[PDB]
Design a protein around this ligand. Structure first.
Ligand SMILES: NC(=O)c1ccc[n+]([C@@H]2O[C@H](COP(=O)([O-])OP(=O)(O)OC[C@H]3O[C@@H](n4cnc5c(N)ncnc54)[C@H](OP(=O)(O)O)[C@@H]3O)[C@@H](O)[C@H]2O)c1
Ligand SMILES: COc1ccc2c(c1)c(CC(=O)O)c(C)n2C(=O)c1ccc(Cl)cc1
Length: 316
C-alpha cells in the first residue's frame, strides 16, 4: 500500500512521483540505476518523456524490478509525454508506440501533451532551419487531444493529461465540442516561490490534479535557468522548518505540496537523497507552518522554454 489520489477518469495516481530528467551531460546509464533505486525506496510513480532521451533506460529499470519480483506492473504508475514534433493528430499514436517500443512496456499509465507549442514533424525534437530558427508548426491542439483520447481507447494510455497548460489552454480543451475525456492532470512548475494558487484552484474546480515539477527549485541547468535566480532549498524559513522537524528543506517543500492537494515530483540520482525523499510520508506540517510557506511566494518562475516563445500557444 502507498498513498494515491483518484483521478477524474477513475484511475489512481501515486502522490509522490520520481522525476527522471537529467541534463544531457549526465550519462544516460545513471537513469537506469536511479529508477531502480527509486522503486527500491518506495516510489510507485515514475515520470519520463520522449524528449528526455532516457526511455530505454527507464523502461529497462522498470522491466528489471518487475522481472526480479520486487514490484508488479500494476504497482508502477509510468508517465510519458508527447513531444511537440508529434502534435499532428496522425503522429500522436505513432509517437506513443515509439515510446512504448523504447520502454518495452505494453502501456503507459499516463500520456501528457508536453508543451502546447508545436514544431515541425520529424526525428529532431528541436527542428531548426539553416539559420538556426526553430521550425514552428501550426496544429489545432483540440485535434491533438482527440488523437490522445483514441490512444486511451486503444488501452495504450490508461489516462491522458496535459503539461504546461494555462487557464486559456485548459479551457480550450474542457470546452471542446464532443469532449470525451477531460485531462486528468496539468503538470506544471510548482514550488514555495511559485505556488500556483490560482491555477491550482482552477484545476481543483474541474477535478484536475496539479502535478508539481521543479518542486525542489529545479535542475538549475543553464541556459534554461537564470543562475541569478535564488536557490529555493537555501531559503531560511524552509531551513528553519527543516531544522525544527529534523528533516531537510527538500522534505518540507515536498510535504507542503502534498498537504495542499498537489501531486509532487522529485528528481534525484543520489541514493541517499532518493531514500530521504520518501520520508515525506513520515511527518506533517501544521496550519501555521503551511501559511508560513505560503508567504514565501514570489512569482519566481524558474523554467520558461523561451526558445518556444512567439507563437500564440506559448503559455507563459
Ligand atoms: N513537464 C515539464 O515540462 C517538466 C519540466 C521540468 C521537470 N519535469 C519533471 O519534473 C522532474 C523534477 O523536476 P527537476 O528535475 O526540475 O528537479 P527537482 O525535483 O526540483 O530537483 C532539483 C534538484 O534537487 C536535487 N535534490 C533532490 N532531492 C534532494 C534532497 N532531498 N535534498 C537536496 N537536494 C535534492 C536533485 O539533485 P540530485 O539528483 O543530486 O539529488 C535535483 O537536481 C524532472 O525530472 C521531470 O521528470 C517536467
Ligand atoms: C518549460 O521550461 C522548460 C525549459 C527547458 C526544458 C523544458 C522545459 C523541458 C521539458 C521537461 O523538462 O519536461 C526540457 C526537456 N527542457 C530542456 O532543457 C530541453 C533539453 C533538451 C532538449 Cl533536446 C529539449 C529541451
Amino acid at each position: 500500500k502507498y498513498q494515491c489520489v483518484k483521478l477524474n477518469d477513475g484511475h489512481f495516481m501515486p502522490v509522490l512521483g520520481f522525476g527522471t530528467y537529467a541534463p544531457a551531460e549526465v550519462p544516460k546509464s545513471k537513469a537506469l540505476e536511479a529508477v531502480k533505486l527509486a522503486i527500491e525506496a518506495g516510489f510507485h510513480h515514475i515520470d519520463s518523456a520522449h524528449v528526455y532521451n532516457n526511455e530505454e533506460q527507464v523502461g529497462l529499470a522498470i522491466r528489471s524490478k518487475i522481472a526480479d519480483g520486487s514490484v508488479k506492473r500494476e504497482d508502477i504508475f509510468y508517465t510519458s509525454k508527447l513531444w511537440s514534433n508529434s502534435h499532428r493528430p496522425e503522429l500522436v499514436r505513432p509517437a506513443l508506440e515509439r515510446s512504448l517500443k523504447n520502454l518495452q512496456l505494453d502501456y503507459v499509465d499516463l500520456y501528457l501533451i508536453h508543451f502546447p507549442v508545436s514544431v515541425k514533424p520529424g526525428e529532431e525534437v528541436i527542428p531548426k532551419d539553416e539559420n538556426g530558427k526553430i521550425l514552428f508548426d501550426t496544429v489545432d491542439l483540440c485535434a491533438t487531444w482527440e488523437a490522445m483520447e483514441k490512444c486511451k481507447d486503444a488501452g495504450l494510455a490508461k489516462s491522458i493529461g496535459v503539461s504546461n497548460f494555462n487557464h486559456r489552454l485548459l479551457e480550450m480543451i474542457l470546452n471542446k465540442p464532443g469532449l470525451k475525456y477531460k485531462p486528468v492532470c496539468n503538470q506544471v512548475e510548482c514550488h514555495p516561490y511559485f505556488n500556483q494558487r490560482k491555477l491550482l484552484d482552477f484545476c481543483k474546480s474541474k477535478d484536475i490534479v496539479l502535478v508539481a515539477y521543479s518542486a525542489l527549485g529545479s535542475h538549475r541547468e543553464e541556459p534554461w535557468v537564470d543562475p541569478n535566480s535564488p536557490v529555493l532549498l537555501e531559503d531560511p524559513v524552509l531551513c528553519a522548518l527543516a531544522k525544527k522537524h529534523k528533516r531537510t528543506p527538500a522534505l518540507i517543500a515536498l510535504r507542503y505540496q502534498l498537504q495542499r492537494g498537489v501531486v509532487v515530483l522529485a528528481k534525484s540520482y543520489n541514493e541517499q537523497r532518493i531514500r530521504q525523499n520518501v520520508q515525506v510520508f513520515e511527518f506533517q506540517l501544521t496550519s501555521e507552518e503551511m501559511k508560513a510557506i505560503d508567504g514565501l511566494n514570489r512569482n519566481v518562475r524558474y523554467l520558461t522554454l523561451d526558445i518556444f516563445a512567439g507563437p500564440p500557444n506559448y503559455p507563459f
